[PDB]
UniProtKB/Swiss-Prot annotation, chain A:
Present with 14600 molecules/cell in log phase SD medium. Belongs to the ATPase F chain family. Mitochondrial membrane ATP synthase (F(1)F(0) ATP synthase or Complex V) produces ATP from ADP in the presence of a proton gradient across the membrane which is generated by electron transport complexes of the respiratory chain. F-type ATPases consist of two structural domains, F(1) - containing the extramembraneous catalytic core and F(0) - containing the membrane proton channel, linked together by a central stalk and a peripheral stalk. During catalysis, ATP synthesis in the catalytic domain of F(1) is coupled via a rotary mechanism of the central stalk subunits to proton translocation. This is ATP synthase subunit f, mitochondrial. GO terms for cellular component: mitochondrial inner membrane; mitochondrion; proton-transporting ATP synthase complex. It comes from Saccharomyces cerevisiae (strain ATCC 204508 / S288c) (Baker's yeast). One of its GO terms (biological process) is proton transmembrane transport.
Curated annotation (Swiss-Prot), chain B:
It comes from the Eukaryota. It is found in: Mitochondrion; Mitochondrion inner membrane. This is ATP synthase subunit H, mitochondrial. The keyword Membrane applies. Its main location: mitochondrion. F-type ATPases have 2 components, CF(1) - the catalytic core - and CF(0) - the membrane proton channel. In yeast, the dimeric form of ATP synthase consists of 17 polypeptides: alpha, beta, gamma, delta, epsilon, 4 (B), 5 (OSCP), 6 (A), 8, 9 (C), d, E (Tim11), f, g, h, i/j and k. Mitochondrial membrane ATP synthase (F(1)F(0) ATP synthase or Complex V) produces ATP from ADP in the presence of a proton gradient across the membrane which is generated by electron transport complexes of the respiratory chain. F-type ATPases consist of two structural domains, F(1) - containing the extramembraneous catalytic core and F(0) - containing the membrane proton channel, linked together by a central stalk and a peripheral stalk. During catalysis, ATP synthesis in the catalytic domain of F(1) is coupled via a rotary mechanism of the central stalk subunits to proton translocation. The gene is ATP14.
Length: 85, 62
């Protein structure tokens, strides 16, 4: 007898599976995606964007800024020692 | 001799024995006609079924 009409009806496979949710996510995310992100920090300029760039970038974490930062406070109180003495 | 006597007697005095076609009819199956030419009923006639089917099974194909 005469075949039923379901095989030629589709209209809820688009909620029917899980990658639909991911699809509607990644059509927004990827379509308006940039090839590369914006920045790993770069502001501190006054001849100190260089200080941050050399020391406090993702390029390295090394003891050089620590030494520098320590020395600033040492220079304050060391001069003040002779202001107190 | 006796052959001739029998031949003559037999043939002459009764050739065939009685028979009647009318009597035969009772003892044999009579022709009887098929009843109705028949016409097949209109199967699933019209969109009454279709409108019903589209609604009934709106089932998708997954």
């Amino acid at each position: 007898v005469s075949t039923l009409i379901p095989p030629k009806v589709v209209s809820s496979k688009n909620i029917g599976s899980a990658p639909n949710a991911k699809r509607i996510a990644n059509v927004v995310h990827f379509y308006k995606s940039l090839p590369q992100g914006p920045a790993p920090a770069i502001k501190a300029n006054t001849r100190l964007a260089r200080y941050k760039a050399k020391y406090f970038d993702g390029d390295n974490a090394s003891g050089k800024p620590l030494w520098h930062f320590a020395l600033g406070i040492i220079a304050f109180g060391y001069s003040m020692e002779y202001y107190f003495h | 001799n006796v052959i001739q006597d029998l031949y003559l007697r037999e043939l002459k005095d009764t050739k065939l024995a009685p028979s009647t076609l009318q009597d035969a009819e009772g003892n044999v199956k009579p022709w009887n006609p098929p009843q109705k030419p028949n016409l097949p009923e209109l199967e699933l006639q019209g969109p009454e079924a279709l409108k019903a089917y589209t609604e009934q099974n709106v089932e998708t194909a997954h």
